[PDB]
Scaffold this active site. Structure first.
Site, PDB file in Angstrom:
ATOM      1  N   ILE A   1       0.765  -1.231   0.000  1.00 20.52           N
ATOM      2  CA  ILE A   1       0.000   0.000   0.000  1.00 20.52           C
ATOM      3  C   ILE A   1       0.800   1.289   0.000  1.00 20.52           C
ATOM      4  CG2 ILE A   1      -1.448   1.273   1.703  1.00 20.52           C
ATOM      5  CD1 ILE A   1      -2.500  -1.905  -0.006  1.00 20.52           C
ATOM      6  N   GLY A   2       1.824   1.395   0.817  1.00 24.18           N
ATOM      7  CA  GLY A   2       2.585   2.618   0.868  1.00 24.18           C
ATOM      8  C   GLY A   2       3.017   2.853   2.274  1.00 24.18           C
ATOM      9  N   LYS A   3       3.569   4.007   2.588  1.00 22.67           N
ATOM     10  CA  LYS A   3       4.025   4.287   3.937  1.00 22.67           C
ATOM     11  C   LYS A   3       3.038   4.992   4.836  1.00 22.67           C
ATOM     12  CE  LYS A   3       6.131   7.040   5.823  1.00 22.67           C
ATOM     13  NZ  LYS A   3       6.941   8.042   6.552  1.00 22.67           N
ATOM     14  N   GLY A   4       2.801   4.460   6.005  1.00 19.56           N
ATOM     15  CA  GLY A   4       1.901   5.101   6.894  1.00 19.56           C
ATOM     16  C   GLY A   4       2.611   5.309   8.169  1.00 19.56           C
ATOM     17  N   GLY A   5       2.602   6.518   8.653  1.00 16.24           N
ATOM     18  CA  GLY A   5       3.292   6.777   9.864  1.00 16.24           C
ATOM     19  C   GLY A   5       4.734   6.491   9.648  1.00 16.24           C
ATOM     20  N   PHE A   6       5.270   5.642  10.483  1.00 16.33           N
ATOM     21  CA  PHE A   6       6.654   5.271  10.456  1.00 16.33           C
ATOM     22  C   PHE A   6       7.002   4.071   9.636  1.00 16.33           C
ATOM     23  CE2 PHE A   6       4.518   2.844  13.619  1.00 16.33           C
ATOM     24  CZ  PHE A   6       4.890   1.589  13.243  1.00 16.33           C
TER      25      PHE A   6
ATOM     26  N   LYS B   1       2.073  -3.622   8.992  1.00 16.45           N
ATOM     27  CA  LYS B   1       2.991  -2.517   9.054  1.00 16.45           C
ATOM     28  C   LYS B   1       4.347  -2.949   9.583  1.00 16.45           C
ATOM     29  CE  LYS B   1       1.907   2.192  10.070  1.00 16.45           C
ATOM     30  NZ  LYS B   1       1.238   2.773  11.247  1.00 16.45           N
TER      31      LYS B   1
ATOM     32  N   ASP C   1       0.331  14.448  14.997  1.00 13.28           N
ATOM     33  CA  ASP C   1       0.703  14.330  13.604  1.00 13.28           C
ATOM     34  C   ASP C   1      -0.577  14.297  12.804  1.00 13.28           C
ATOM     35  OD1 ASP C   1       2.247  13.820  11.382  1.00 13.28           O
ATOM     36  OD2 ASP C   1       2.993  11.869  12.071  1.00 13.28           O
TER      37      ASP C   1
HETATM   38  C1  LIG Z   1      -6.963   0.337   0.275  1.00 12.26           C
HETATM   39  O1  LIG Z   1      -5.839   0.767   0.989  1.00 12.26           O
HETATM   40  C2  LIG Z   1      -5.386   2.089   0.870  1.00 12.26           C
HETATM   41  C3  LIG Z   1      -5.021   2.710  -0.348  1.00 12.26           C
HETATM   42  C4  LIG Z   1      -4.531   4.037  -0.339  1.00 12.26           C
HETATM   43  C5  LIG Z   1      -4.190   4.688  -1.548  1.00 12.26           C
HETATM   44  O2  LIG Z   1      -4.976   4.527  -2.483  1.00 12.26           O
HETATM   45  N1  LIG Z   1      -3.061   5.471  -1.696  1.00 12.26           N
HETATM   46  C6  LIG Z   1      -2.037   5.730  -0.602  1.00 12.26           C
HETATM   47  C7  LIG Z   1      -0.539   5.800  -1.070  1.00 12.26           C
HETATM   48  C8  LIG Z   1      -0.368   5.560  -2.608  1.00 12.26           C
HETATM   49  N2  LIG Z   1       1.051   5.690  -3.082  1.00 12.26           N
HETATM   50  C9  LIG Z   1       1.564   4.513  -3.849  1.00 12.26           C
HETATM   51  C10 LIG Z   1       2.031   4.795  -5.308  1.00 12.26           C
HETATM   52  N3  LIG Z   1       1.726   6.173  -5.739  1.00 12.26           N
HETATM   53  C11 LIG Z   1       2.191   6.411  -7.120  1.00 12.26           C
HETATM   54  C12 LIG Z   1       2.306   7.139  -4.774  1.00 12.26           C
HETATM   55  C13 LIG Z   1       1.586   7.052  -3.405  1.00 12.26           C
HETATM   56  C14 LIG Z   1      -1.370   6.434  -3.405  1.00 12.26           C
HETATM   57  C15 LIG Z   1      -2.847   6.133  -3.034  1.00 12.26           C
HETATM   58  C16 LIG Z   1      -4.425   4.717   0.886  1.00 12.26           C
HETATM   59  C17 LIG Z   1      -4.747   4.110   2.094  1.00 12.26           C
HETATM   60  C18 LIG Z   1      -5.211   2.805   2.081  1.00 12.26           C
HETATM   61  N4  LIG Z   1      -5.564   2.158   3.184  1.00 12.26           N
HETATM   62  C19 LIG Z   1      -4.829   2.159   4.287  1.00 12.26           C
HETATM   63  N5  LIG Z   1      -5.245   1.425   5.335  1.00 12.26           N
HETATM   64  C20 LIG Z   1      -4.540   1.393   6.540  1.00 12.26           C
HETATM   65  C21 LIG Z   1      -3.374   2.141   6.659  1.00 12.26           C
HETATM   66  C22 LIG Z   1      -2.983   2.873   5.529  1.00 12.26           C
HETATM   67  N6  LIG Z   1      -3.720   2.883   4.386  1.00 12.26           N
HETATM   68  N7  LIG Z   1      -1.925   3.708   5.449  1.00 12.26           N
HETATM   69  C23 LIG Z   1      -1.094   3.855   4.207  1.00 12.26           C
HETATM   70  C24 LIG Z   1      -1.675   4.545   6.449  1.00 12.26           C
HETATM   71  C25 LIG Z   1      -1.524   5.844   5.979  1.00 12.26           C
HETATM   72  C26 LIG Z   1      -1.283   6.858   6.866  1.00 12.26           C
HETATM   73  C27 LIG Z   1      -1.210   6.537   8.215  1.00 12.26           C
HETATM   74  C28 LIG Z   1      -1.399   5.246   8.699  1.00 12.26           C
HETATM   75  C29 LIG Z   1      -1.634   4.219   7.797  1.00 12.26           C
HETATM   76  C30 LIG Z   1      -1.862   2.959   8.391  1.00 12.26           C
HETATM   77  O3  LIG Z   1      -1.380   2.678   9.503  1.00 12.26           O
HETATM   78  N8  LIG Z   1      -2.727   2.038   7.874  1.00 12.26           N
HETATM   79  C31 LIG Z   1      -2.844   0.750   8.712  1.00 12.26           C
END
Ligand SMILES: COc1cc(C(=O)N2CCC(N3CCN(C)CC3)CC2)ccc1Nc1ncc2c(n1)N(C)c1ccccc1C(=O)N2C
EC number: 2.7.11.1
Length: 260
Positions: free
Chosen positions: A16-21, A39, A132
């Protein structure tokens, strides 16, 4: 009080990407093919995300709100967290689709959900200071107005460090331990962003030193739109005041938002 799971119990899917740390991945529990999120720490003493790791775990463990992100279990080599993957994304990105604006009924839904989550955080003895809080940290579960939960709060390693200071309460800048009123200030910024769709303070370009001073000393804030409800405006204005004391209790914020 927190379960340990083994690597044989979960299946990884995509990252998915980076969340928090850490780095978030999408996965499923093998017993249930239910989706989950994992994570992990991503690799000079900066690897002090480890504390953020533990800090997030401890805090998530003791909380239980619909508007707060949940933790399911722990994994050990390497250390990992299995938690909820919110389906619809993060607030920051959603606001980036200008072509498709969020519905007012929904924006209201988002605002309330966040408040309810934050209200809950602050009702804890002792209270919880996120520190944050910005749009990247607000996760979206449904963008449907009739859904039980639309928005959830996230990223509980309580550190500060769109993320630089547009979102930070003034006493906070260049400071370490950040009352709970910092969060109230941040929430105002979040309300401003959901409403406008524009990031906070983006209407200004000042050098960093000047910018801090403008906010700390002069009172600069974002400009709320003429077509903004007075009830909502008044709320935003209070939460983002220079004097932390003048910032409201979440009981007030929530009630007022409900009337909108
Ligand atoms: C279906 O799951 C998710 C999808 C997306 C999403 O569509 N994104 C986020 C990052 C993404 N990137 C990847 C490639 N792109 C070209 C650049 C950026 C772009 C679009 C965003 C969040 C999603 N769900 C998700 N659930 C729990 C989280 C969490 N997120 N993250 C990443 C967190 C983010 C911030 C803080 C905490 C979390 C986290 O702990 N969890 C568990």
């Amino acid at each position: 009080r927190l379960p340990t799971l083994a690597d044989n119990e979960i299946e990884y899917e995509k990252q998915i990407g980076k969340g928090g740390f850490g780095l978030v991945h999408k996965g499923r529990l093998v017993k249930d093919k239910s989706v989950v999120a994992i994570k992990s720490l991503i690799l000079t003493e900066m690897i002090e995300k480890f504390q953020e790791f533990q800090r997030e775990v401890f805090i998530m463990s003791n909380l239980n709100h619909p508007n707060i992100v949940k933790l399911y279990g722990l994994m050990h080599n390497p250390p990992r967290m299995v938690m909820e993957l919110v389906p619809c994304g993060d607030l920051y990105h959603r606001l980036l689709d200008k072509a498709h604006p969020i519905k007012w009924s929904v924006k209201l839904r988002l605002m309330l959900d966040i408040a309810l989550g934050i209200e809950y955080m602050q009702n804890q003895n002792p209270p919880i200071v996120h520190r944050d809080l910005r749009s990247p940290n607000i996760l979206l579960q449904s963008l449907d107005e009739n859904a039980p939960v639309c928005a959830k709060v996230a990223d509980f390693g309580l550190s500060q460090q769109l993320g630089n200071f547009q979102w930070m309460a003034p006493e906070t800048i260049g400071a370490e331990e950040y009352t709970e009123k910092a969060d109230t200030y941040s929430f105002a910024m979040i309300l401003y962003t959901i409403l406008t769709g524009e990031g906070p303070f983006d209407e200004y370009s000042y050098g960093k030193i000047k910018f801090i001073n403008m906010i700390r000393e002069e009172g600069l804030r974002p400009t709320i739109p003429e077509d903004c409800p007075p009830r909502l405006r008044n709320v935003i204005e209070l939460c983002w005041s220079g004097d932390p004391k003048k910032r409201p209790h979440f009981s007030y914020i929530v009630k007022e938002l409900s009337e909108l």
